[PDB]
Symmetry: C2
Subunit: 77 residues, 2 copies
């Protein structure tokens, strides 16, 4: 059975980890991706229905391929 | 920075390619992923901005990791 909350929260945990590893603040990431900082923060908590376009804007801003983002998500405990 | 129409169209083309490679019709993918056929068709055409949840469902239905799906999309 699909757990929408866990899927979203796992995405957000992975974003926070990658962003923080890269030394980028939420505000910086928001600016680079053309998104609101409140929205970045919400995504990091799994509050948003993040979709393909914003996934790619965020990954582009962090200079990481989406495949690598999802591989890290998949490798999480 | 990304071009949004290109991303949506490239995802849709990649989905059609993987599904067809695996011998799965749009109707069967809808059945397996718990989505409507029309939605699958729209996604394949690049007319939707597919959600993380539905990416997950489609990839699971096709027995492909999302990372691998996106690696193919990135080719």
């Amino acid at each position: 059975m699909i757990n929408e909350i866990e899927i979203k929260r796992k995405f957000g945990r992975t974003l926070k980890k990658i962003r923080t590893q890269k030394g980028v603040s939420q505000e910086e990431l928001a600016d680079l991706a053309g998104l609101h900082r409140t929205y970045i923060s919400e995504v990091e908590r799994g509050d948003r229905n993040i979709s393909l376009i914003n996934i790619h804007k965020i990954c582009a801003a962090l200079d990481i391929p989406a495949s690598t983002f999802f591989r890290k998500m998949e490798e999480e405990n």
